[PDB]
Design a protein around this motif. Structure first.
Motif, PDB file in Angstrom:
ATOM      1  N   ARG A 100       0.811  -1.218   0.000  1.00  0.00           N
ATOM      2  CA  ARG A 100       0.000   0.000   0.000  1.00  0.00           C
ATOM      3  C   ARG A 100       0.845   1.269   0.000  1.00  0.00           C
ATOM      4  O   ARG A 100       0.474   2.264  -0.587  1.00  0.00           O
ATOM      5  N   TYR A 104       1.164   4.195  -2.914  1.00  0.00           N
ATOM      6  CA  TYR A 104       1.070   5.625  -2.653  1.00  0.00           C
ATOM      7  C   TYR A 104       2.251   6.378  -3.264  1.00  0.00           C
ATOM      8  O   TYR A 104       2.070   7.368  -3.970  1.00  0.00           O
TER       9      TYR A 104
ATOM     10  N   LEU B 106      -4.791  -2.230   1.368  1.00  0.00           N
ATOM     11  CA  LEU B 106      -3.838  -1.735   0.362  1.00  0.00           C
ATOM     12  C   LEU B 106      -4.057  -0.268  -0.002  1.00  0.00           C
ATOM     13  O   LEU B 106      -3.603   0.182  -1.062  1.00  0.00           O
ATOM     14  N   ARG B 107      -4.717   0.474   0.889  1.00  0.00           N
ATOM     15  CA  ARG B 107      -5.056   1.872   0.658  1.00  0.00           C
ATOM     16  C   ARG B 107      -4.639   2.761   1.833  1.00  0.00           C
ATOM     17  O   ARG B 107      -4.699   2.347   2.990  1.00  0.00           O
ATOM     18  N   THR B 108      -4.215   3.982   1.519  1.00  0.00           N
ATOM     19  CA  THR B 108      -3.865   4.989   2.528  1.00  0.00           C
ATOM     20  C   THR B 108      -5.122   5.731   3.002  1.00  0.00           C
ATOM     21  O   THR B 108      -5.238   6.129   4.175  1.00  0.00           O
ATOM     22  N   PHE B 109      -6.049   5.932   2.068  1.00  0.00           N
ATOM     23  CA  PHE B 109      -7.362   6.496   2.367  1.00  0.00           C
ATOM     24  C   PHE B 109      -8.444   5.549   1.880  1.00  0.00           C
ATOM     25  O   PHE B 109      -8.193   4.674   1.040  1.00  0.00           O
ATOM     26  N   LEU B 114      -4.655   9.805  -3.447  1.00  0.00           N
ATOM     27  CA  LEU B 114      -3.473  10.403  -2.827  1.00  0.00           C
ATOM     28  C   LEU B 114      -3.869  11.349  -1.689  1.00  0.00           C
ATOM     29  O   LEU B 114      -3.021  11.781  -0.911  1.00  0.00           O
TER      30      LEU B 114
END
Ligand code: CL
Lengths: 121, 177
Positions: A100, A104, B106-109, B114
Protein backbone atom coordinates in the motif's frame (compact mmCIF):
# COMPACT_ATOMS: atom_id res chain seq x y z
CA UNK A 1 20.87 12.72 -7.09
CA UNK A 2 17.86 10.87 -8.51
CA UNK A 3 14.79 11.61 -10.60
CA UNK A 4 12.55 10.42 -7.74
CA UNK A 5 14.08 12.87 -5.24
CA UNK A 6 13.86 15.69 -7.79
CA UNK A 7 10.13 15.06 -8.35
CA UNK A 8 9.53 14.83 -4.59
CA UNK A 9 11.22 18.22 -4.15
CA UNK A 10 8.89 19.71 -6.82
CA UNK A 11 5.83 18.82 -4.68
CA UNK A 12 4.40 21.29 -2.16
CA UNK A 13 4.33 18.78 0.73
CA UNK A 14 8.14 18.58 0.41
CA UNK A 15 8.48 22.06 1.93
CA UNK A 16 6.53 21.40 5.16
CA UNK A 17 8.37 22.08 8.45
CA UNK A 18 8.35 18.67 10.15
CA UNK A 19 10.21 18.57 13.48
CA UNK A 20 11.33 15.09 14.50
CA UNK A 21 11.20 13.78 18.04
CA UNK A 22 14.29 11.83 19.17
CA UNK A 23 12.34 8.68 18.28
CA UNK A 24 11.59 9.92 14.75
CA UNK A 25 15.19 11.07 14.24
CA UNK A 26 16.35 7.66 15.47
CA UNK A 27 13.99 6.01 12.91
CA UNK A 28 15.12 8.12 9.96
CA UNK A 29 18.69 7.43 11.13
CA UNK A 30 18.31 3.66 11.22
CA UNK A 31 16.76 3.53 7.73
CA UNK A 32 19.57 5.61 6.25
CA UNK A 33 22.10 3.26 7.93
CA UNK A 34 20.27 0.32 6.29
CA UNK A 35 20.40 2.09 2.92
CA UNK A 36 24.12 2.81 3.41
CA UNK A 37 24.81 -0.85 4.31
CA UNK A 38 23.04 -1.92 1.10
CA UNK A 39 20.81 -4.24 3.15
CA UNK A 40 17.29 -3.02 2.46
CA UNK A 41 16.32 -6.54 1.27
CA UNK A 42 17.03 -8.29 4.64
CA UNK A 43 15.17 -5.44 6.37
CA UNK A 44 11.94 -5.72 4.33
CA UNK A 45 10.04 -7.52 7.12
CA UNK A 46 11.03 -4.74 9.53
CA UNK A 47 9.83 -2.25 6.89
CA UNK A 48 6.51 -4.07 6.60
CA UNK A 49 6.19 -3.85 10.42
CA UNK A 50 6.86 -0.10 10.49
CA UNK A 51 4.26 0.36 7.78
CA UNK A 52 1.67 -1.85 9.54
CA UNK A 53 1.14 0.92 12.11
CA UNK A 54 2.46 3.97 10.21
CA UNK A 55 1.35 5.39 6.87
CA UNK A 56 4.85 6.69 6.14
CA UNK A 57 8.17 5.38 7.44
CA UNK A 58 8.95 8.11 10.00
CA UNK A 59 5.40 8.39 11.48
CA UNK A 60 4.69 11.63 9.62
CA UNK A 61 1.55 13.25 8.18
CA UNK A 62 3.24 13.53 4.75
CA UNK A 63 5.95 11.46 3.05
CA UNK A 64 9.54 12.48 3.87
CA UNK A 65 12.93 12.02 2.15
CA UNK A 66 13.21 8.74 4.11
CA UNK A 67 10.13 7.43 2.26
CA UNK A 68 11.54 8.46 -1.14
CA UNK A 69 15.01 7.04 -0.48
CA UNK A 70 13.67 3.70 0.84
CA UNK A 71 11.05 3.59 -1.93
CA UNK A 72 13.66 3.99 -4.68
CA UNK A 73 15.47 0.85 -3.49
CA UNK A 74 12.40 -1.08 -2.28
CA UNK A 75 10.31 -0.78 -5.46
CA UNK A 76 12.42 -3.05 -7.70
CA UNK A 77 13.01 -5.36 -4.70
CA UNK A 78 9.28 -5.82 -4.10
CA UNK A 79 8.20 -6.31 -7.73
CA UNK A 80 10.92 -8.98 -8.06
CA UNK A 81 9.55 -10.99 -5.12
CA UNK A 82 5.99 -10.59 -6.45
CA UNK A 83 7.22 -11.85 -9.85
CA UNK A 84 9.18 -14.73 -8.26
CA UNK A 85 6.43 -15.68 -5.76
CA UNK A 86 5.17 -19.27 -5.58
CA UNK A 87 2.03 -18.15 -3.72
CA UNK A 88 0.79 -14.98 -5.46
CA UNK A 89 -1.04 -14.53 -3.01
CA UNK A 90 0.46 -15.07 0.43
CA UNK A 91 3.11 -12.51 -0.53
CA UNK A 92 0.29 -9.95 -0.89
CA UNK A 93 -1.51 -10.76 2.36
CA UNK A 94 1.80 -10.72 4.25
CA UNK A 95 3.58 -7.70 2.75
CA UNK A 96 0.41 -5.68 2.19
CA UNK A 97 1.74 -2.72 4.17
CA UNK A 98 4.80 -2.24 1.95
CA UNK A 99 2.45 -2.75 -1.01
CA UNK A 100 0.00 0.00 0.00
CA UNK A 101 2.93 2.30 0.72
CA UNK A 102 4.54 1.41 -2.63
CA UNK A 103 1.21 2.21 -4.33
CA UNK A 104 1.07 5.62 -2.65
CA UNK A 105 4.67 6.61 -3.37
CA UNK A 106 4.77 5.41 -6.99
CA UNK A 107 1.62 7.43 -7.76
CA UNK A 108 2.71 10.48 -5.76
CA UNK A 109 6.04 10.56 -7.63
CA UNK A 110 4.39 9.65 -10.98
CA UNK A 111 6.42 6.50 -11.69
CA UNK A 112 5.92 5.36 -15.30
CA UNK A 113 3.19 2.76 -15.84
CA UNK A 114 5.90 0.43 -17.16
CA UNK A 115 8.03 0.76 -13.99
CA UNK A 116 4.97 0.78 -11.72
CA UNK A 117 4.10 -2.28 -9.62
CA UNK A 118 0.50 -3.23 -10.46
CA UNK A 119 -1.44 -3.56 -7.20
CA UNK A 120 -4.16 -6.22 -7.28
CA UNK A 121 -6.60 -4.82 -4.68
CA UNK B 1 -22.48 32.09 4.69
CA UNK B 2 -24.11 29.07 6.38
CA UNK B 3 -24.33 28.44 10.12
CA UNK B 4 -23.51 25.08 11.66
CA UNK B 5 -24.64 24.71 15.26
CA UNK B 6 -23.06 21.86 17.23
CA UNK B 7 -24.47 20.51 20.50
CA UNK B 8 -21.95 19.73 23.25
CA UNK B 9 -24.46 17.52 25.13
CA UNK B 10 -25.29 15.24 22.18
CA UNK B 11 -24.79 11.53 23.04
CA UNK B 12 -22.98 11.43 19.68
CA UNK B 13 -21.07 14.69 19.13
CA UNK B 14 -21.13 15.74 15.46
CA UNK B 15 -17.38 15.56 14.85
CA UNK B 16 -17.67 14.56 11.18
CA UNK B 17 -19.88 17.60 10.53
CA UNK B 18 -17.57 19.86 12.51
CA UNK B 19 -14.50 18.63 10.65
CA UNK B 20 -16.26 18.99 7.27
CA UNK B 21 -16.92 22.64 8.20
CA UNK B 22 -13.31 23.12 9.30
CA UNK B 23 -12.11 21.75 5.94
CA UNK B 24 -14.40 24.17 4.07
CA UNK B 25 -13.36 27.19 6.17
CA UNK B 26 -9.63 26.38 5.85
CA UNK B 27 -9.91 26.37 2.04
CA UNK B 28 -12.59 29.08 1.85
CA UNK B 29 -12.50 31.44 4.86
CA UNK B 30 -15.79 32.63 6.42
CA UNK B 31 -17.91 30.11 4.52
CA UNK B 32 -19.45 28.52 7.62
CA UNK B 33 -20.02 30.15 10.99
CA UNK B 34 -19.59 27.43 13.62
CA UNK B 35 -21.72 27.81 16.76
CA UNK B 36 -21.93 25.74 19.93
CA UNK B 37 -24.92 25.04 22.12
CA UNK B 38 -24.89 22.94 25.30
CA UNK B 39 -28.44 21.67 25.78
CA UNK B 40 -29.80 18.12 25.87
CA UNK B 41 -32.96 19.10 23.92
CA UNK B 42 -30.92 20.59 21.04
CA UNK B 43 -30.18 18.56 17.89
CA UNK B 44 -26.64 17.14 17.59
CA UNK B 45 -26.02 19.29 14.52
CA UNK B 46 -27.93 21.91 12.55
CA UNK B 47 -26.93 23.51 9.22
CA UNK B 48 -28.95 26.71 8.94
CA UNK B 49 -32.41 25.17 9.01
CA UNK B 50 -31.63 21.47 8.53
CA UNK B 51 -31.19 18.94 11.34
CA UNK B 52 -31.19 15.83 9.08
CA UNK B 53 -28.38 14.72 6.74
CA UNK B 54 -26.19 17.66 7.79
CA UNK B 55 -22.88 16.07 6.72
CA UNK B 56 -24.05 15.42 3.15
CA UNK B 57 -25.62 18.88 3.05
CA UNK B 58 -22.20 20.43 3.79
CA UNK B 59 -20.33 18.20 1.34
CA UNK B 60 -22.94 18.81 -1.39
CA UNK B 61 -22.94 22.60 -0.83
CA UNK B 62 -19.16 22.78 -1.19
CA UNK B 63 -18.83 20.54 -4.25
CA UNK B 64 -15.49 21.95 -5.44
CA UNK B 65 -13.90 21.17 -2.07
CA UNK B 66 -15.54 17.75 -1.76
CA UNK B 67 -14.69 16.67 -5.31
CA UNK B 68 -13.14 13.22 -4.90
CA UNK B 69 -14.57 9.76 -4.60
CA UNK B 70 -17.37 8.47 -6.80
CA UNK B 71 -20.43 9.91 -4.98
CA UNK B 72 -22.10 6.48 -4.71
CA UNK B 73 -18.84 5.15 -3.29
CA UNK B 74 -18.55 8.07 -0.87
CA UNK B 75 -22.14 7.43 0.25
CA UNK B 76 -21.39 3.79 1.13
CA UNK B 77 -18.81 4.95 3.67
CA UNK B 78 -20.67 8.02 4.89
CA UNK B 79 -23.62 5.69 5.61
CA UNK B 80 -21.38 3.15 7.43
CA UNK B 81 -19.99 6.01 9.57
CA UNK B 82 -23.36 7.52 10.47
CA UNK B 83 -25.27 4.28 11.11
CA UNK B 84 -22.58 1.81 12.26
CA UNK B 85 -19.33 3.40 13.48
CA UNK B 86 -21.16 5.61 16.00
CA UNK B 87 -22.78 2.58 17.69
CA UNK B 88 -21.54 2.06 21.28
CA UNK B 89 -21.77 -1.75 21.11
CA UNK B 90 -18.54 -3.75 20.77
CA UNK B 91 -20.18 -6.68 18.98
CA UNK B 92 -21.68 -4.53 16.20
CA UNK B 93 -18.68 -2.16 16.06
CA UNK B 94 -16.26 -5.07 15.65
CA UNK B 95 -17.99 -6.21 12.45
CA UNK B 96 -18.24 -2.61 11.14
CA UNK B 97 -14.56 -1.95 11.88
CA UNK B 98 -13.45 -5.09 10.03
CA UNK B 99 -15.22 -3.82 6.92
CA UNK B 100 -13.23 -0.59 7.22
CA UNK B 101 -9.98 -2.39 8.12
CA UNK B 102 -10.34 -4.65 5.07
CA UNK B 103 -10.99 -1.69 2.76
CA UNK B 104 -7.70 -0.19 4.02
CA UNK B 105 -5.51 -3.31 3.41
CA UNK B 106 -3.84 -1.74 0.36
CA UNK B 107 -5.06 1.87 0.66
CA UNK B 108 -3.87 4.99 2.53
CA UNK B 109 -7.36 6.50 2.37
CA UNK B 110 -10.74 4.79 2.22
CA UNK B 111 -11.34 5.36 -1.53
CA UNK B 112 -7.68 4.91 -2.50
CA UNK B 113 -6.62 8.41 -3.55
CA UNK B 114 -3.47 10.40 -2.83
CA UNK B 115 -5.67 12.54 -0.55
CA UNK B 116 -8.58 11.92 1.81
CA UNK B 117 -12.21 12.23 0.76
CA UNK B 118 -15.51 12.89 2.53
CA UNK B 119 -15.57 9.13 3.22
CA UNK B 120 -12.51 9.55 5.46
CA UNK B 121 -13.99 12.58 7.23
CA UNK B 122 -17.28 10.82 8.01
CA UNK B 123 -15.65 7.64 9.35
CA UNK B 124 -12.96 9.47 11.31
CA UNK B 125 -15.56 11.80 12.87
CA UNK B 126 -17.87 8.85 13.68
CA UNK B 127 -15.03 7.01 15.45
CA UNK B 128 -13.97 10.15 17.34
CA UNK B 129 -17.57 10.39 18.62
CA UNK B 130 -17.48 6.79 19.87
CA UNK B 131 -15.80 6.40 23.28
CA UNK B 132 -15.73 2.65 22.72
CA UNK B 133 -13.34 2.94 19.76
CA UNK B 134 -10.59 4.49 21.91
CA UNK B 135 -9.23 1.23 23.31
CA UNK B 136 -9.85 -0.51 19.98
CA UNK B 137 -7.74 2.03 18.10
CA UNK B 138 -5.14 2.38 20.89
CA UNK B 139 -4.62 -1.42 21.02
CA UNK B 140 -4.27 -1.73 17.23
CA UNK B 141 -6.61 -4.73 16.96
CA UNK B 142 -7.56 -3.48 13.50
CA UNK B 143 -4.08 -2.44 12.40
CA UNK B 144 -5.15 -0.64 9.20
CA UNK B 145 -7.85 1.35 11.02
CA UNK B 146 -5.36 2.44 13.71
CA UNK B 147 -2.74 3.32 11.07
CA UNK B 148 -5.33 5.33 9.11
CA UNK B 149 -6.96 6.94 12.13
CA UNK B 150 -3.66 8.11 13.63
CA UNK B 151 -2.63 9.63 10.28
CA UNK B 152 -5.64 11.95 10.06
CA UNK B 153 -5.39 12.74 13.80
CA UNK B 154 -2.04 14.41 13.00
CA UNK B 155 -3.82 16.87 10.71
CA UNK B 156 -5.02 19.70 13.01
CA UNK B 157 -8.24 20.03 10.97
CA UNK B 158 -9.14 16.61 12.41
CA UNK B 159 -6.99 16.31 15.53
CA UNK B 160 -7.79 19.73 16.98
CA UNK B 161 -11.52 19.59 16.19
CA UNK B 162 -12.14 18.45 19.77
CA UNK B 163 -9.95 21.31 21.07
CA UNK B 164 -12.12 23.74 19.09
CA UNK B 165 -15.27 22.18 20.57
CA UNK B 166 -13.90 22.34 24.12
CA UNK B 167 -12.75 25.98 23.75
CA UNK B 168 -16.08 27.00 22.24
CA UNK B 169 -17.94 25.37 25.17
CA UNK B 170 -15.59 27.33 27.45
CA UNK B 171 -16.51 30.57 25.65
CA UNK B 172 -20.21 29.68 25.88
CA UNK B 173 -19.85 29.35 29.67
CA UNK B 174 -17.80 32.58 29.81
CA UNK B 175 -20.52 34.54 27.98
CA UNK B 176 -23.09 33.16 30.43
CA UNK B 177 -21.03 34.05 33.52
CL1 CL C 1 -16.62 24.66 -2.74
Amino acid sequence: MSDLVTKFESLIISKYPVSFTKEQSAQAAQWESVLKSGQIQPHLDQLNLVLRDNTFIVSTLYPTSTDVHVFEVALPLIKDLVASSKDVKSTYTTYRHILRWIDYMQNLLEVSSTDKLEINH
Amino acid sequence: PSTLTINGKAPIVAYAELIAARIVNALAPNSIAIKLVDDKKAPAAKLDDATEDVFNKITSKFAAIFDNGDKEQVAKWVNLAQKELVIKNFAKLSQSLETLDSQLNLRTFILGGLKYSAADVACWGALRSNGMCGSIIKNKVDVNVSRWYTLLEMDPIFGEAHDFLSKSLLELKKSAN
